[PDB]
Amino acid sequence: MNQQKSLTLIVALTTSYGIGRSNSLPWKLKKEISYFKRVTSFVPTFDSFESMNVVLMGRKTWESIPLQFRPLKGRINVVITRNESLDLGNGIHSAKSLDHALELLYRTYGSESSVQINRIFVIGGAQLYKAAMDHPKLDRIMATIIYKDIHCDVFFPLKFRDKEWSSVWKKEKHSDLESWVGTKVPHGKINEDGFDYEFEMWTRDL
Ligand SMILES: NC(=O)C1=CN([C@@H]2O[C@H](COP(=O)(O)OP(=O)(O)OC[C@H]3O[C@@H](n4cnc5c(N)ncnc54)[C@H](OP(=O)(O)O)[C@@H]3O)[C@@H](O)[C@H]2O)C=CC1
Numbered sequence: 001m002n003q004q005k006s007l008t009l010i011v012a013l014t015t016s017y018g019i020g021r022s023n024s025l026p027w028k029l030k031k032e033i034s035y036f037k038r039v040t041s042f043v044p045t046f047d048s049f050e051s052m053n054v055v056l057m058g059r060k061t062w063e064s065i066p067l068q069f070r071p072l073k074g075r076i077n078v079v080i081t082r083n084e085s086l087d088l089g090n091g092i093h094s095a096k097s098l099d100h101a102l103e104l105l106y107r108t109y110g111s112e113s114s115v116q117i118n119r120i121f122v123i124g125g126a127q128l129y130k131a132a133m134d135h136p137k138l139d140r141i142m143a144t145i146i147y148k149d150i151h152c153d154v155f156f157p158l159k160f161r162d163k164e165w166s167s168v169w170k171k172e173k174h175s176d177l178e179s180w181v182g183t184k185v186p187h188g189k190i191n192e193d194g195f196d197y198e199f200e201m202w203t204r205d206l
């Protein structure tokens, strides 16, 4: 009653797998903002009327979101923390692992519920990404690759774009990214903030 759904990871990272610096993201990318909001919020119209996507995030990532942007609107938010006592407010769900979050979600958004789970996204940070990359239901990575070795203090845990992982993770065609996201997506290099970046979708077989 717990693993009938794939997990998707969404991440922005450098070519050296850097993902963060000083509890924030060391870049200011307008399209990337638009894209993260769209991908995590989009529900295909063939999915049920009640459907909403889930964002799962680590406690440090939650604490990095400014209060005025919390919870992330139009998505079911879950914070993974081993601190049972931590008050999230607004009915935001708290869970002590990735699988505890999945069990809580299925228990809460059940047969009857006016809200039903659609896609489930892991949105960071580094420690939660490590658990997700180990999870047997993770099959899809929406990667924004940043073409500059911007100095970071936190790194992505598995080098999924590198030769060593290339028999498991495969980059899909841009039109398949656009099919899955349901909307035209900029194709190829985008240049803001002094360097190029681009959107990619990588998948693996479970
Ligand atoms: N580039 C990107 O796409 C993204 C980058 N980031 C960057 O990541 C950095 C933060 O990463 P990190 O410090 O790793 O923080 P996380 O957001 O992963 O938060 C870590 C805390 O979350 C909880 N936690 C995480 N994983 C688990 C687990 N598997 N089981 C139980 N609890 C877990 C623990 O909370 P507790 O201590 O309360 O028990 C842990 O101390 C920041 O720089 C941020 O800006 C964040 C999101 C996206």
Ligand SMILES: CN(c1cc(F)c(F)c(F)c1)c1cnc2nc(N)nc(N)c2c1
Residues within 6 Å of the ligand: 010, 011, 012, 032, 033, 036, 061, 064, 065, 066, 069, 072, 122, 123, 124, 142, 143, 144
């Ligand atoms: C953690 N985070 C974030 C932080 C905030 F303060 C926000 F208001 C927000 F919408 C997202 C964030 C931002 N952009 C991202 N982009 C990609 N591609 N992947 C992520 N997981 C991500 C997370």
